[PDB]
Description:
Layout: E1 7-9, E2 12-14, E3 18-20, H1 35-44, E4 50-52, E5 56-57, H2 74-89, E6 93-99, E7 117-118, E8 129-131, E9 137-139, E10 144-145, H3 148-167, E11 172-177, H4 182-187, H5 202-205, H6 207-220, E12 225-229, H7 243-261, E13 267-271, H8 279-292, E14 297-300, H9 305-313, E15 319-322, H10 324-328, H11 332-338
Parallel strand pairs: 3-4, 3-15, 4-6, 5-6, 6-11, 7-10, 11-12, 12-13, 13-14, 14-15
Antiparallel strand pairs: 1-2, 8-9
Helix pairs in contact: 1-2, 3-6, 6-7, 7-8
Bound molecules: flavin mononucleotide (FMN) and ethyl (2Z)-2-hydroxyimino-3-oxidanylidene-butanoate.
Amino acid sequence: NPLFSPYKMGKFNLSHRVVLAPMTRCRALNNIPQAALGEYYEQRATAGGFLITEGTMISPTSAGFPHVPGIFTKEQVREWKKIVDVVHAKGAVIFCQLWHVGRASHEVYQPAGAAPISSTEKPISNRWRILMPDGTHGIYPKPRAIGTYEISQVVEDYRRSALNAIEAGFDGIEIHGAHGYLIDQFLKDGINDRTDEYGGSLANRCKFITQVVQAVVSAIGADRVGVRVSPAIDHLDAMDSNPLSLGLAVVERLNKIQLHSGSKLAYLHVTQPRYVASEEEEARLMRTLRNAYQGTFICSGGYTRELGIEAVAQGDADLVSYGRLFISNPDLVMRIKLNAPLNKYNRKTFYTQDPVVGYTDYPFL
Ligand SMILES: Cc1cc2nc3c(=O)[nH]c(=O)nc-3n(C[C@H](O)[C@H](O)[C@H](O)COP(=O)(O)O)c2cc1C
Ligand SMILES: CCOC(=O)/C(=N\O)C(C)=O
């Protein structure tokens, strides 16, 4: 089984290639990591396995989901610290994904009922609805397009949250730059209609993510930084005229950062375009991005045991992260190794607040 050969991710010796994909579950009540989270992660932690946390707020403005954890307060750091500890006692490596939704938010999720922030004032269309804290769905509002001063503050929010994660004992962080969220809103030319140094050209659209990655690499070291992108996805009206060129331009920026830092990023994490909330065209994009990036490649989005094995065997990826099957199979690593039957997942408790139901009461074998 290719998925169970060891893999060296920077300074981390992983014993297998099955990765817990980052997944918002909304159990971190009031944006504070809860003991529920620690049981949840401990359930899935394996000796030599890599875990990525649910997206985590870098600022009071970066939320667009209910009860998602933050890591911008010391209270959050201390509660995160207790979760990182039980993960490490199981022998796993854990990154914290840093997440700013940008315009994928609502007045209800913003301090003082303010507008969400973004690269543009273009709102997400009425094709998409936002889950509300009471379980209904709301209308995405028109965002505020931020200037370059505020952009630098957001970059610093990323840098401070990156240090706080280390303080909490995380092995590293992942920059969430995918899925139509704040960084994607700058990357994709379907969203970024700016006329300043952050918009227009492809280089300009790439400036935000480059600066975010540079700041966190400066902060904690390139080998503790992962980057997630999704140059082609159907999510929150996040489209580009030339997804593959956008992908390649991001990858070149990352290669350049690695050479100048003199160290490799922890990894590049890329969402398969088939994933939602032509086939060869989609596999083309993934292998084209992988072949272009100097370092470790995690693929994600609709993978199964079979698709995961082939991905590693065929050289398409170094690591494979699983999402939904990890929600419902806490010992998913164990099950993949044994090729044991997997347990179904219940979408309806993906985003509910219960600390047990649909969260930690999925059984082992
Ligand atoms: C409930 C749920 C929450 C998710 N939240 C995030 C997230 O916070 N950050 C992120 O990068 N991806 C998120 N995603 C996507 C996963 O990280 C992953 O890429 C995707 O689930 C992989 O496809 P799979 O479910 O078939 O394994 C989420 C997916 C699910 C099902
Ligand atoms: C389809 C890609 O978008 C996602 O999976 C997501 N966050 O990144 C959530 C919270 O659903």
